[PDB]
Design an enzyme around this catalytic site. Structure first.
Site, PDB file in Angstrom:
ATOM      1  N   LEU D  39       0.833  -1.190   0.000  1.00  0.00           N
ATOM      2  CA  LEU D  39       0.000   0.000   0.000  1.00  0.00           C
ATOM      3  C   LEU D  39       0.872   1.247   0.000  1.00  0.00           C
ATOM      4  CD1 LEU D  39      -2.441  -1.201   2.771  1.00  0.00           C
ATOM      5  CD2 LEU D  39      -2.953  -1.143   0.348  1.00  0.00           C
ATOM      6  N   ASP D  40       0.359   2.309  -0.607  1.00  0.00           N
ATOM      7  CA  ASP D  40       1.066   3.582  -0.636  1.00  0.00           C
ATOM      8  C   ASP D  40       0.712   4.423   0.581  1.00  0.00           C
ATOM      9  OD1 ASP D  40      -1.284   5.460  -1.378  1.00  0.00           O
ATOM     10  OD2 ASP D  40      -1.345   3.949  -2.968  1.00  0.00           O
ATOM     11  N   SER D  41       1.291   5.614   0.655  1.00  0.00           N
ATOM     12  CA  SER D  41       1.110   6.487   1.801  1.00  0.00           C
ATOM     13  C   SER D  41      -0.296   7.055   1.861  1.00  0.00           C
ATOM     14  CB  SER D  41       2.131   7.612   1.736  1.00  0.00           C
ATOM     15  OG  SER D  41       2.245   7.944   0.385  1.00  0.00           O
ATOM     16  N   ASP D  43      -2.881   5.702   0.883  1.00  0.00           N
ATOM     17  CA  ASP D  43      -3.692   4.620   1.432  1.00  0.00           C
ATOM     18  C   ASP D  43      -3.545   4.539   2.945  1.00  0.00           C
ATOM     19  OD1 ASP D  43      -4.632   3.844  -1.098  1.00  0.00           O
ATOM     20  OD2 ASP D  43      -2.868   2.582  -1.433  1.00  0.00           O
TER      21      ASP D  43
END
Ligand SMILES: CCCCCCCCCCCCCCCCCC(=O)OC[C@H](COP(=O)([O-])OCC[N+](C)(C)C)OC(=O)CCCCCCCCCCCCCCCCC
Ligand SMILES: CCCCCCCCCCCCCCCCCC(=O)OC[C@H](COP(=O)([O-])OCC[N+](C)(C)C)OC(=O)CCCCCCCCCCCCCCCCC
Ligand SMILES: CCCCCCCCCCCCCCCCCC(=O)OC[C@H](COP(=O)([O-])OCC[N+](C)(C)C)OC(=O)CCCCCCCCCCCCCCCCC
Ligand SMILES: CCCCCCCCCCCCCCCCCC(=O)OC[C@H](COP(=O)([O-])OCC[N+](C)(C)C)OC(=O)CCCCCCCCCCCCCCCCC
Ligand SMILES: CCCCCCCCCCCCCCCCCC(=O)OC[C@H](COP(=O)([O-])OCC[N+](C)(C)C)OC(=O)CCCCCCCCCCCCCCCCC
Ligand SMILES: CCCCCCCCCCCCCCCCCC(=O)OC[C@H](COP(=O)([O-])OCC[N+](C)(C)C)OC(=O)CCCCCCCCCCCCCCCCC
Ligand code: SF4
Ligand code: SF4
Ligand code: SF4
Lengths: 209, 115, 155, 85, 176, 115
Positions: D39-41, D43
């Protein structure tokens, strides 16, 4: 002053305004970069952008100035300059019946300090500059678009913004609302090249490169 | 020469804090926007669009530019929250009328001279 | 014969509508002053039965008198949609007719016919009060030629 | 009722199981949102932002900055709400 | 010099005080205003019976555009394109080519009347009195397309309105 | 009999006019036509929100004042009695206290609207 067609010259004002420029430069050396008075008698003070509040407050409040009215505050886009934006303050002194222009500079990313503390008129003028040129005035009560449409992206008065813009509006029955689409013109604006190849004003001839 | 007046952030770490805070405000506000403006999109669609706008600029590394983008975003928030905008303005992010434009060489070749 | 009845009934409904045109109090710029002058003593639009009413619900005609910007355009469609039918639009001045002297501006709709339908176009910048009056009377004649009930009978 | 260390973990993982971007049995209390789950930031902001709704208290950006693991989130909630079982 | 618009103090004698009280109680000044509206009621109205009566105009009136001719019937226009260049609205479009007799004449002369501001600069710029803003103001249309004028339209307007156009020029050409 | 018959006619005529109004004309209904009016921009709230009353005190005072006309309205019938002295004293008493009520509210800044 007997030449019918030529504007008369008023040297008394030129001597008066020139002296007051020396007066300001002597009092505010920390910020003043240049003082010039024009042929038609208008004094311009050119300052570092970090002296906006000091210089404006001095002019407003000093007893030998009393420039209590901010007639106008605007900007000029000069792309060739590395600091493309020239911020101009025009002030009026009712006590002495005089006008002074104050000039400073900034670029796309560098903020200028808001003059609202000095003149409450500057609130809307500074909003217009932001909307039209994209210059940010720090510590403003409410900086937001004032003249452009809601959601308008871009700063129209920059010299690199197309005259007709990038988008245009119409009503679409399918979605039953006004929609924005890329601009297509039935008749393209016709750019006329009017400048003459022959010099007109020798006195302003720029030194050869 | 490189010494320049900041806008708000003094480093990208401080700026990226403001980007995340702004995403939080937008994410809370889509549910109300869909309800207030009476849009026909879903909350997920709006929150996806917010993500797309934040992704477009995912390459910048200048603290001053990121500050301006955050400033511009926050302005759009005041407009949408206060209903200064209208349904036409909110729905301009989704470009519904614009039919898809070709994005392959052959398709561009068949239609016109553009790159 | 029912073709006679619809024709006379059609005349009546047309006569009432053209004899009681109520424009919306709606102006945008310097074509509005000349609209005021059509309401002033010399020309007196009232004598023709033309009465200005503010609300769109109580209006029959929108006279677009000035430059339609992009910020304004959504509002003009709203008040138009809110006008009960039958409704007519008069475009007054170059700015509204086709953008005029701001036609090449980022902030100007290049004609109000992009936003709303238009029945009459009055040329000028500004059109004279007499020229707007010619347009209003020309709209009256357009209504007089409507054949809504004759078409219904033959539908 | 008074919150439990086990209860907090149960409700925290419950939220993340509902997140369409997270695979349930891949999810674990020691799973890193970045290194593992992918997951990205942005997210992560959404995830923390869901916990605030879940437990009805706001986590500041400085502290939500560092919560990159369900157990870390559980510990932070426990620390604020004084849970020690 | 300056004057004070509202810097007068009232008189506090009983007669003055009583008079003001009457004004307050008997509404004298309000009754005064009713008289003015009553006087106007018995004045002749300023209305004109349009279209049977028209508002006055002058020879300088700037109205519908027309293209003129010499008495021979030859077009005055020589395609110099000064009108096109001065038009503040870019409303004029001109294309020219040599005519079969070698004359410098137009193949296109289009005026977008929804771009025009009716400023008259194009009749000032014309060196041969070819393009004129005529007297007519009653050319409202039911469609936008009818207001995009081409050369044939502008020539027909000239042949339609020449008698009035020439007389007005005769009256004002000494001021020009 | 005649009153009821007259009332029925007056309201029935109005209802017939309304029925004609909603049925005779041609209709074309769509969401934007039937939308709240606020000078062309969509409303930024609901008309059903609280609307502050700055003359609340005068409104309450109206109820008390609006009763005492009921006490005073019978005076034409009361001036018909043979015990006039008792009347006139009591009639003027009732009016005078209404004046005293007005003065107390007036002097205590109760007739001025709140900000
Ligand atoms: C009121 C209660 C509700 C309605 C009850 C039922 C209707 C009763 C009222 C009838 C009004 C008749 C009005 C006549 C119109 C008129 O004055 O003509 C002037 C007009 C004058 O022409 P004009 O309209 O072009 O005037 C232009 C302006 N001037 C003249 C100054 C340049 O005559 C006509 O042109 C013909 C118009 C149609 C005539 C009326 C047709 C209907 C008649 C039969 C109706 C019953 C059918 C069943
Ligand atoms: C107080 C005063 C009260 C005054 C009351 C008015 C008295 C005079 C009324 C004259 C008749 C008015 C008819 C109006 C009907 C609307 C209209 O203009 O026609 C459009 C429509 C046109 O019909 P259409 O079917 O051809 O097209 C409409 C459908 N769309 C929109 C899709 C195109 O008229 C009708 O639909 C039927 C009209 C029949 C004839 C008139 C009504 C007769 C029924 C009487 C009850
Ligand atoms: C003699 C034996 C004993 C019996 C004595 C009986 C008493 C006789 C003396 C009493 C004098 C009473 C004077 C009249 C009432 C005073 C009204 C008043 O208070 O005015 C103050 C008010 C207030 O004036 P103001 O400007 O002073 O308001 C501020 C008041 N102060 C300063 C005190 C706070 O004036 C008005 O009423 C203005 C009304 C505006 C609307 C006017 C519309 C135009 C009307 C024009 C036509 C009028 C004629 C109508 C005729 C109808 C025919 C059927
Ligand atoms: C068609 C019909 C035609 C006939 C119409 C009849 C006349 C209608 C009114 C005309 C108005 C004339 C104005 C005028 O003369 O007033 C000037 C004057 C102007 O007064 P003033 O306010 O300018 O100051 C002068 C007065 N002092 C000196 C005290 C300051 O007004 C009057 O004096 C008239 C007073 C009349 C009061 C009427 C109100 C009492 C009503 C009681 C019920 C009845
Ligand atoms: C109770 C007496 C008044 C009730 C009707 C009031 C009214 O006119 O509003 C109609 C209201 C307003 O709602 P509406 O806007 O939907 O009107 C009907 C719309 N059309 C014409 C398309 C069907 O409608 C009704 O409640 C129906 C009333 C029926 C009345 C009998 C009609 C018979 C035909 C003549
Ligand atoms: C339902 C029963 C089927 C028959 C209905 C019918 O005849 O259509 C009438 C129609 C059917 O519904 P409608 O919606 O089509 O009626 C409106 C039609 N226009 C607008 C064209 C007139 O409605 C009516 O009541 C006729 C209009 C009567 C207006 C005069 C009222 C006098 C009381
Ligand atoms: S059309 Fe003419 S009168 Fe009307 S707004 Fe434009 S410039 Fe002004
Ligand atoms: S009147 Fe002015 S705006 Fe109109 S065509 Fe002539 S020069 Fe252009
Ligand atoms: S200025 Fe006159 S002669 Fe020249 S192109 Fe225009 S209309 Fe023709």
């Amino acid at each position: 002053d007997t030449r019918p067609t030529v504007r008369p010259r008023n040297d008394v004002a030129h001597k008066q305004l020139s002296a007051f420029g020396e007066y300001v430069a002597e009092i505010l050396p920390k910020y003043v970069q240049q003082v010039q008075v024009s042929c038609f008698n208008e004094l311009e003070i050119c300052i570092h952008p970090d002296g906006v509040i000091p210089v404006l407050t001095f002019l407003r409040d000093h007893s030998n100035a009393q420039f209590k009215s901010l007639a106008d505050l605007t900007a000029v886009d000069i792309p060739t300059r590395q600091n493309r934006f020239e911020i101009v303050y025009n002030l009026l002194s009712l006590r002495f019946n005089s006008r002074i222009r104050v000039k400073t500079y900034t670029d796309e990313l560098t903020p200028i300090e808001s003059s609202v503390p000095v003149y409450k008129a500057a609130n809307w003028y500074e909003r217009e500059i932001w909307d039209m040129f994209g210059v940010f005035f720090a510590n403003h009560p409410d900086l937001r678009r004032i003249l452009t449409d809601y959601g308008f992206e871009g700063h129209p008065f920059r010299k690199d913004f197309p005259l007709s813009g990038y988008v245009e509006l119409r009503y679409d029955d399918e979605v039953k609302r006004v929609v924005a689409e890329p601009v297509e013109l039935a008749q393209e604006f016709r750019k006329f090249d009017l400048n003459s190849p022959w010099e007109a004003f020798p006195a302003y001839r720029q030194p050869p490169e | 020469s490189t010494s320049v007046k900041p806008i708000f952030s003094r480093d990208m770490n401080e700026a990226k804090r403001r980007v995340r805070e702004l995403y939080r405000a937008w994410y809370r506000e889509v549910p109300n926007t869909v309800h207030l403006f009476q849009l026909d999109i879903s909350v997920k669609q709006g929150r996806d669009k917010v993500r797309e706008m934040f992704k477009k600029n995912a390459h910048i590394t200048d603290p001053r530019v990121v500050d301006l983008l955050v400033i511009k975003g926050k302005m759009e928030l005041e407009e949408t929250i206060k209903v200064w905008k209208q349904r036409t303005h909110v729905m301009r992010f989704f470009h519904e009328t614009e039919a898809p434009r070709p994005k392959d060489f052959l398709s561009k070749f068949y239609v016109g001279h553009d790159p | 014969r029912g073709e006679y009845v619809v024709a006379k009934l059609d005349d009546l409904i047309n006569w009432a509508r053209r004899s009681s045109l109520w424009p919306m109090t709606f102006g945008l710029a310097c074509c509005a002053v000349e609209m005021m002058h059509m309401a002033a003593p010399r020309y007196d639009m009232d004598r023709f039965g033309v009465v200005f009413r503010a609300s769109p619900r109580q209006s029959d005609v929108m006279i677009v008198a000035g430059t339609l910007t992009n910020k304004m355009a959504p509002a003009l469609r709203k008040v138009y949609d809110q006008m009960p039918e039958p409704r007519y639009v008069v475009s007054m001045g170059s700015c509204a007719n086709g953008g005029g002297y701001y036609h090449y501006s980022y902030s100007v709709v290049r004609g109000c016919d992009r936003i709303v339908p238009v029945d009459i176009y009055v040329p000028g910048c500004p059109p004279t009060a007499e020229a707007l009056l010619y347009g209003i009377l020309q709209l009256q004649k357009k209504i007089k030629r409507e054949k809504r009930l004759r078409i219904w009978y033959r539908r | 009722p008074p919150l439990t260390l086990e209860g907090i973990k149960d409700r925290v993982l419950y939220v993340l199981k509902l997140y369409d971007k997270i695979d349930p049995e891949k999810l674990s209390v020691n799973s890193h949102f970045m290194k593992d789950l992918g997951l990205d930031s942005l997210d992560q902001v959404e995830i923390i932002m869901a916990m605030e709704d879940e437990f009805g208290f706001e986590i500041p950006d400085i502290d939500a900055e560092k919560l990159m693991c369900p157990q870390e989130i559980v510990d932070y909630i426990a620390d604020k709400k004084d849970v020690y079982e | 010099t300056y004057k004070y618009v509202n810097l007068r103090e009232p008189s506090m004698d009983m007669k003055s005080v009583t008079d003001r009280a009457a004004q307050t109680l008997l509404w004298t000044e309000l009754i005064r205003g009713l008289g003015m509206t009553l006087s106007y009621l018995f004045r002749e109205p300023a209305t004109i019976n349009y279209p049977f009566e028209k508002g006055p105009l002058s020879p300088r009136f700037r109205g519908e555009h027309a293209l003129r001719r010499y008495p021979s019937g030859e077009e005055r226009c020589i395609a110099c394109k000064l009108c096109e260049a001065v038009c503040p609205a870019q409303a004029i479009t001109i294309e020219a080519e040599p005519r079969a007799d070698g004359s410098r004449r137009t193949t296109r002369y289009d005026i977008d009347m929804t771009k025009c501001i009716y400023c008259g600069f194009c009749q000032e710029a014309c060196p041969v009195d070819a393009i004129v803003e005529g007297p007519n103001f009653e050319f409202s249309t039911e469609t936008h397309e009818e207001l995009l004028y081409n050369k044939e339209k502008l020539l027909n307007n000239g042949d339609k309105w020449e008698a009035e156009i020439a007389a007005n020029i005769q009256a004002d050409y000494l001021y020009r | 009999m005649n009153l009821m018959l007259a009332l029925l006619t007056n309201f029935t005529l109005a209802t017939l006019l309304v029925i004609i109004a909603f049925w005779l004309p041609q209709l074309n209904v769509y969401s934007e036509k039937t939308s709240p009016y606020e000078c062309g921009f969509d409303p930024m709230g609901s008309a059903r929100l609280p609307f502050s009353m700055k003359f609340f005190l005068v409104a309450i005072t109206f109820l008390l004042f609006d009763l005492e006309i009921a006490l005073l309205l019978p005076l034409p019938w009361a001036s018909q009695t043979a015990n006039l002295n008792t009347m006139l004293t009591m009639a003027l008493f009732l009016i005078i206290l209404l004046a005293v009520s007005l003065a107390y509210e007036w002097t205590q800044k109760g007739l001025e609207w709140t900000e």
